Amino acid sequence: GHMSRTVMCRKYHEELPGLDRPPYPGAKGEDIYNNVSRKAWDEWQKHQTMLINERRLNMMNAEDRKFLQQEMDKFLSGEDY
Template identity: 55%
Template sequence: MSQTVFCRKYQQDMEALPFPPLPGEKGQQIQANVSKQAWDEWQALQTRLINEQHLNMLDPDARAYLMDQMERFLDNRETDRAEGYVPPET
């Protein structure tokens, strides 16, 4: 049976991440408070932002920008969107 967490994004008990997605205390906090679904959705948005804005992940400013966008996404605040992105129809 999988573990559950109270997801800070969806405000309900959901499937937990199997391991911390980042090193250190930040990764531990995310694993304890963010669901697998929310993290997977963040990963998809992060990929679109990196590609659309041509972010260089060696640049500390680009990494700081993504960390800010991640916090905004997980707190249900407005985030930047990749221009021209149209989600697939389900």
């Protein structure tokens, strides 16, 4: 076995390995660090890539970012995505 920092994951409702550090500075980054598992975070990144490819999204387009931000919030909220 190994040693891992773990958190009660808001998405999966179970104790899982957490991130080693917040993904970025700020309140949102802190929320993710404290309440989102590494698995949930990784699964979100995979889903985000899928959405960007399937919808032809551009991170520099405000609407495309808004869409992704709305899906991320839903994805990591605790609800069934």
